[PDB]
Design a protein around this ligand. Structure first.
Ligand SMILES: *[C@@H]1O[C@H](CO)[C@@H](O)[C@H](O)[C@H]1NC(C)=O
Ligand SMILES: *[C@@H]1O[C@H](CO)[C@@H](O)[C@H](O)[C@H]1NC(C)=O
Ligand SMILES: *[C@@H]1O[C@H](CO)[C@@H](O)[C@H](O)[C@H]1NC(C)=O
Ligand SMILES: *[C@@H]1O[C@H](CO)[C@@H](O)[C@H](O)[C@H]1NC(C)=O
Ligand SMILES: *[C@@H]1O[C@H](CO)[C@@H](O)[C@H](O)[C@H]1NC(C)=O
Ligand SMILES: *[C@@H]1O[C@H](CO)[C@@H](O)[C@H](O)[C@H]1NC(C)=O
Lengths: 596, 198
């Protein structure tokens, strides 16, 4: 009869057939990931083509129902999600060109091999070897060679491709009633139609700047401390008044600073909190790791894993004969089928990753009641954030002592908390300026603020201004330095890490306040608290049915993203860094003082 | 059978032993409405209707008086004044294949809700809009029966469950489906209470 009832029946038929097709596609992808064989690749390609064609046909058919005659919020949300053209609005030639460009960028990044001139008999790929070289070397010219050679080859190959990519994506986005591709990415956080909880695309950049302005003193102090320690490690390269050399940050691109913990340790004399040896001595299998994680999740009041999870997951490397992707990934295959694909080793990192992925599984299980097209997080930040809070809680010494992995007579003094907080800052705080600078640069590129001939001159200027990292040698416009990273080269949003990082500490403060924890925020464990689990599950059950602002009100009691929980988390470390930086100068100069 | 074309077997003129069914550990749901399982083995009824079908794990709750859902509204409807038992058990072993078993269907749409104990086996295209379907599944016109792709690796809420609903009615005809009668070791030459043949 009415348009709303027609849309509801169409959504019901769509959900029913979509869930089955998504299951078939997801199962084919799972069979490829756990078994890399050519027939599995063919099955994955066939299932993906069927899934894409089905999404194209339902997108074509969903648009015939006008949005303004529907009053139900959930139905309008599903219809808004389905009615996106995607690449279909663009011409077939340009769509094929864009797909070809994406595929060739994927092949160039995945199979990119670079080695030293005059010794070309064997070369190293980035993921097997260059990462280890960047993470472990202490040699200035070797790191400089690897960084410059990889950016030379990858940037010179990818620069015309990126120039075509920005134009095609901007054309598609403006054809879809967006300002640019950056507006298309920012549209994920857009809430329209809800009274009071509306959020605009333009508000996101202002909120990110407002939070980053408060992030900046802590990052400046951390940068000064890391600069002083790197000056101790490398005597002449680093200037007291200038920025850090780009190739000395411990990773290939500067994404994380977690590989500088050895060089920048506050108290080397004190022991670490490594629990690897304890699991090795007691013969803890990966199955025991996941059972302990399940015990942690039942302690807080969340549902335990299904029998199908234990039966169908691959929690150990299969063997030499069968090849599998080693990256830990949680799979929500559909129809109540939840699996984890991780090649689990006996390490602390794998244990925390197991907690993180089981948090992903719990989040997936929670919104199973929702309709198929709403079975996602409210935004891209929440999905990662709910795993990261488990990663925070599991890593605490109280959790390790409770489960027996740490000695009951371990002395928790201030020095171990300071060095642990510094490691957490290098992993978590350090990625925030890089993420903000990269996303702001990409937004300015899509918006047309920066012309193509001035991309790099602004970019390094941004990096000195924001990240406090100086280029080793000046780069001209023949380079394509941003596209050397996995996410940007393969058409992925990057603001999810920034939002995840802020939401992580906001959720952590909310659950710790719910659990009546009486100490420091970093010493908080959310085990044994039913009320904290209930407060979490209230947001978890919603999925994408409600706005992210309402979900944040449900958890933390605020209608906007907040920066205060992160600063509260690192407050002992902030005071310690302020004490240690009395002689040194906090802040950096954008001039070429260290090296150029 | 499928939930829409649910099989109905009329059971008459025999002895129904309900204790064998009740004491089995193979059944997940044995919810009786309108009568208790303990006194079923004694009572007698004129006819027994055994309706058999397959539904999902999460859809077992909808087979009850006064409930709502796709199965109750469009596939199998129970009366509010229902006397009988709903028995459900997991059948992932038999009704699921690795490729997907598409032999089980459900009616997804209909203009009006079903009456109690009604079967709809029509395969006419559902009309959700003003436009006539004309036998083609085009815009606003969808096919009523949809398959459940039962696979063994499904969750417990999506695995196939075989449901048998027993309906007990009393009519003015002589009741012939009576519960089994238990007989003791005969004792002779003593003053005893005898109940030979009622
Ligand atoms: C993996 O693929 C090979 C290819 O023939 C097959 O023989 C094997 O059974 C598969 N293993 C699993 C666990 O699927
Ligand atoms: C919106 O639709 C859902 C299912 O489509 C329904 O459960 C809900 O009650 C509806 N809300 C309103 C306000 O009509
Ligand atoms: C999708 O593209 C078609 C083709 O121009 C257009 O008519 C339609 O409005 C687009 N959808 C949306 C939601 O803008
Ligand atoms: C989950 O918990 C319930 C009740 O505590 C238990 O019966 C069930 O066996 C558990 N699941 C698994 C897979 O052990
Ligand atoms: C730790 O505490 C002791 C005694 O309270 C103090 O002497 C020491 O300086 C503190 N260290 C740090 C890093 O706060
Ligand atoms: C949480 O509960 C378990 C089970 O009673 C207990 O063993 C554990 O010690 C508790 N955690 C804490 C921190 O007391």
């Amino acid at each position: 009869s009415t348009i709303e009832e027609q849309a509801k029946t169409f959504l019901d038929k769509f959900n029913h057939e979509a869930e089955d097709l998504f299951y078939q596609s997801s199962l084919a992808s799972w069979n490829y990931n756990t078994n890399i064989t050519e027939e599995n690749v063919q099955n994955m390609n066939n299932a993906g083509d069927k899934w894409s064609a089905f999404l194209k046909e339902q997108s074509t058919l969903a648009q015939m129902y006008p949005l303004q005659e529907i009053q139900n919020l959930t139905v309008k949300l599903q219809l808004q999600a389905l009615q996106q053209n995607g690449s279909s609005v663009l011409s077939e030639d340009k769509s094929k060109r864009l797909n070809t460009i994406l595929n060739t960028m994927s092949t160039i990044y995945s199979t990119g091999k670079v080695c030293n001139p005059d010794n070309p008999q064997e070369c190293l790929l980035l993921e097997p070897g260059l990462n280890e070289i960047m993470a472990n070397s202490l040699d200035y010219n070797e790191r400089l060679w690897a960084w410059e050679s990889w950016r030379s080859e990858v940037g010179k190959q990818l620069r015309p491709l990126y120039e075509e990519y920005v134009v095609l994506k901007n054309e598609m986005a403006r054809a879809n009633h967006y300002e640019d591709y950056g507006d298309y990415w920012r549209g994920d956080y857009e809430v329209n139609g809800v009274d009071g909880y509306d959020y605009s695309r333009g508000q996101l950049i202002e909120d990110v700047e407002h939070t980053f302005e408060e992030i900046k003193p802590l990052y400046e102090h951390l940068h000064a401390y890391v600069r002083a320690k790197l000056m101790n490690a490398y005597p002449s390269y680093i200037s007291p008044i200038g920025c850090l050399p780009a190739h000395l940050l411990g990773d290939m691109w500067g994404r994380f600073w977690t590989n500088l913990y050895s060089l920048t340790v506050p108290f080397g004399q004190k022991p670490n909190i490594d629990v690897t040896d304890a699991m090795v001595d007691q013969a803890w299998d990966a199955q025991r790791i996941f059972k302990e994680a399940e015990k942690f999740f039942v302690s807080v009041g969340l549902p335990n894993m299904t029998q199908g999870f234990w039966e169908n997951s691959m929690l150990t490397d299969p063997g030499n004969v069968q090849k599998a992707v080693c990256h830990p990934t949680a799979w929500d295959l559909g129809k109540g089928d939840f699996r984890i694909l991780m090649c689990t080793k006996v390490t602390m990192d794998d244990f925390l990753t197991a907690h993180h992925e089981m948090g992903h599984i719990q989040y997936d299980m929670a919104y199973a009641a929702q309709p198929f097209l709403l079975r996602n997080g409210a935004n891209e930040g929440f999905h990662e954030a709910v795993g990261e809070i488990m990663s925070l809680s599991a890593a605490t010494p109280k959790h390790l002592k409770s489960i027996g992995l740490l000695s009951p007579d371990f002395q928790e003094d201030n020095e171990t908390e300071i060095n642990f907080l510094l490691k957490q800052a290098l992993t978590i705080v350090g990625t925030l300026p890089f993420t903000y600078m990269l996303e702001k640069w990409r937004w300015m590129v899509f918006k047309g603020e920066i012309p193509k001939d001035q991309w790099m001159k602004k970019w390094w200027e941004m990096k000195r201004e924001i990240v406090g990292v100086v280029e080793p040698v000046p780069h001209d416009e023949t380079y394509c330095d941003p596209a050397s990273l996995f996410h940007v080269s393969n058409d992925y949003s990057f603001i999810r890490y920034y939002t995840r990082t802020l939401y992580q500490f906001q959720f952590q403060e909310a659950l710790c306040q719910a659990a009546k924890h009486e100490g420091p925020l970093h010493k908080c464990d959310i085990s044994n608290s039913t009320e904290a689990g209930q407060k979490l599950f209230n947001m978890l059950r919603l999925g994408k049915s409600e706005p992210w602002t309402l979900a944040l009100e449900n958890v933390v009691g605020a209608k906007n993203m907040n920066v205060r929980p992160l600063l509260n988390y690192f407050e002992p470390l902030f005071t310690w860094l302020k004490d240690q930086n009395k002689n040194s100068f906090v802040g950096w100069s954008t001039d070429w003082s260290p090296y150029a | 059978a499928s939930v829409y074309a649910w099989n109905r077997k009329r059971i008459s003129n025999c002895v129904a032993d309900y204790s064998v069914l009740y004491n089995s550990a193979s059944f997940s749901t044995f919810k009786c409405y309108g009568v208790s399982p303990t006194k079923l083995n004694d009572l007698c009824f004129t006819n027994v209707y055994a309706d058999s079908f397959v539904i999902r794990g999460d859809e077992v709750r909808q087979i009850a008086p006064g409930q709502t859902g796709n199965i109750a509204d469009y596939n199998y409807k129970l009366p509010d004044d229902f006397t009988g038992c709903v028995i459900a058990w997991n059948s992932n072993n038999l009704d699921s294949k690795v490729g997907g078993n598409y032999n089980y269907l459900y009616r997804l749409f209909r203009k009006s809700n079903l009456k109690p104990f009604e079967r709809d086996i029509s395969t006419e295209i559902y009309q959700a809009g003003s436009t006539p379907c004309n036998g083609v599944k085009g815009f606003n016109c969808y096919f009523p029966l949809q398959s459940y792709g039962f696979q063994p690796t499904y969750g417990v809420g999506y695995q196939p469950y075989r449901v048998v609903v027993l309906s007990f009615e009393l009519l003015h005809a002589p009741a012939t489906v009576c519960g089994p009668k238990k007989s003791t070791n005969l004792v002779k030459n003593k003053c005893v209470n005898f109940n030979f043949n009622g």
